[PDB]
Write a protein that binds this ligand. Sequence first.
Ligand SMILES: [Ca+2]
Ligand SMILES: [Ca+2]
Ligand SMILES: [Ca+2]
Ligand SMILES: [Ca+2]
Ligand SMILES: [Ca+2]
Ligand SMILES: [Ca+2]
Ligand SMILES: [Ca+2]
Lengths: 273, 284
Amino acid sequence: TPPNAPVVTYSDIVNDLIIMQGTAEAKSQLIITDSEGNTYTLTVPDNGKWSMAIPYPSEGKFTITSVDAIGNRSDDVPLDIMKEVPVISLSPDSDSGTVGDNITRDKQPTFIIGNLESDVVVVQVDINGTVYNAEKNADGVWFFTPGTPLADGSYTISVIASDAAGNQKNSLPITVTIDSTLTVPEIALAAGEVTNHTQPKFTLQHIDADVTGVTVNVTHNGVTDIYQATQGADGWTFTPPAAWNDGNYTLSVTVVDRAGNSQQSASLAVTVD
Amino acid sequence: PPNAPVVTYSDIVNDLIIMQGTAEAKSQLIITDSEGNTYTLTVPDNGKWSMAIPYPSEGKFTITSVDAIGNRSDDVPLDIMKEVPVISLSPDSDSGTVGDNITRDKQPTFIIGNLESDVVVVQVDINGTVYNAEKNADGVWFFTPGTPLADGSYTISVIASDAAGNQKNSLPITVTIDSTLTVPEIALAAGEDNDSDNVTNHTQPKFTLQHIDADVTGVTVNVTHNGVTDIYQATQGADGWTFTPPAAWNDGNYTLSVTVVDRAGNSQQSASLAVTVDSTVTVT
Ligand SMILES: [Ca+2]
Ligand SMILES: [Ca+2]
Ligand SMILES: [Ca+2]
Ligand SMILES: [Ca+2]
Ligand SMILES: [Ca+2]
Ligand SMILES: [Ca+2]
Ligand SMILES: [Ca+2]
C-alpha cells in the first residue's frame, strides 16, 4: 500500500512565504514542487508531524507528495491559493482639477486596476452595490470605464478578482465624487455704497460651497487686472488692495471649484467718484 | 449643502479602520457607526482629511460633511468586512489521534467560525466543488458531506460573504480519509516449528507478525490459553514485527492472533493460529 496522502492542518501567508503545518507518514520524504518547477524536500519527523515555509510561487500553485523509503508515492495533493488583494484607483487622465483627490468633473472616468496575479480569470467592479465586468486592455491590464455618463454625486468603488480555483478577494472601498455643476457667481458693491470710495467693498454672491478659487477681474481703459478674493466666515469678499483712479470700471468674478469647473459672473460697469 | 466627502484610501490595521480622503475645507466630518458611536473632526484648509476609528460591528458606518451653518452633505454609507472565515475538522469526526486531520469517518463534519454577524452566504469548497454550509440549532455553521467520501485527500476552504458582497475564503487545509487496513498474519518464526504442524518444543517460541501496513501505530498479540485471553505488546525487531511470550509456556495448546491499529483508528485482527508446546520428553 502507498503512503496515505499528506495532510495540511494549517496554512498561512506571511510576507511572501507560504507557511504550513500538517501530518504525513513519519520518516517519509515530503516533496513540494511548485508552478515554477522549484522542489522543496524534507524528511517527515518521527512524530508524523511536519512544518515548512516556501517562497510564495507564481499563481499560488504547488503540489505536495509523500514518498516512503522504498520509492512508493502517495496521491498528489495539488493546491492553488491566492495572495494579492486587487487595487483600483481613478486614472490621473480622468481626474480634473487637483489630481489624487478622487474628485472629477469627467462623467465617464476610467478606473485603473492593479495587483492581480497572472491566473486571475474573473475581474469585476462594484459601483454603488452593482457589479460589472471589468475590461482588459491591449497590454493585459484591467480597467473599468462606465458605459454611460454618471450623474453627479458619490460612487463607492471596490474591485473584485478571482482565480480558476475560486479564490476571490475584493478591495476595501474608496469613493469618487463626480461634480460638473457650479453656480454662476455675482459681483455687487457692498450694502452701504456710483461710489465715493477709491477702495469700494464688493459682495460676491452665489458662490457654491465647494468653490476653492475666487478671483475678481477688474477691467479699465483697455487693461485687465486680476485680484485674489478674500474668503471669510460670512463668505468671499473683495476690496482693492490700493487706491483707485477716478473713472469707470468694468468688473466680473470668476469662480473655480475643487473639481475644476469654472463660471464667470455677468459684467458690472461701475463709477468711482 | 456641501458635496459628499470622498474616501481616497482605506485600510484595516490592528482592529482600526484607517482612512484618508477629501472634503469641504474647514467643514466638520462626522463618522457614525452601526453601534451608535459618533466621531468628528475638523477638515483642514487644504481639504485633505485623515482618520482612524475602531472597527465597528459588521464594518458598517457612514461619513457626512456638515458646514458651519449646519448644512449637511449626502451621507456616504460604507459596509466593509474584516474577518476571513475559519474551518476545522470536528473532534467528534476525527478518529484515532485527534488533531492530525486524518480520519476513517467517510462523512466527517467540519465546524466553521470567525464570521461577522452580517454574513448572509456561507459555503464550503471541497476539492473544487462549492456547497452550501448549514447552520445548526445553536446557530453555529458546519458542513457534512452528503454522501460517503472515498479514501484519499480533500482540500477544504470556507467562503463567507456579507450583504454588500464582501467575500473572503480561508487558506486551504486538507483531510485524509483512510478506512483501509490490511489484515495481518501471525506465524511461528523460521526454525520454531520443530516439522510444519505448529508443534514446537520451545517454551517461549518466536512468532513473526506479517502484513502490517506502514501507518500502523499499534501492534498487539492475543494469547488464549485455558479459556483466558491475554494481550501482549509486540516488538519491532531486526527481522520485522515480532513476539515471544514474557514467561515460559506450560506444555499444551495456545491460540494466537495479532491485532493491528492504524493512525486513523482502523483495526484488523489476523486469523487464529493454534500452536502446541511440547517440551516434554517421553520416557521409556
Ligand atoms: Ca491561484
Ligand atoms: Ca480631481
Ligand atoms: Ca461643483
Ligand atoms: Ca460588513
Ligand atoms: Ca485522526
Ligand atoms: Ca490505513
Ligand atoms: Ca513441529
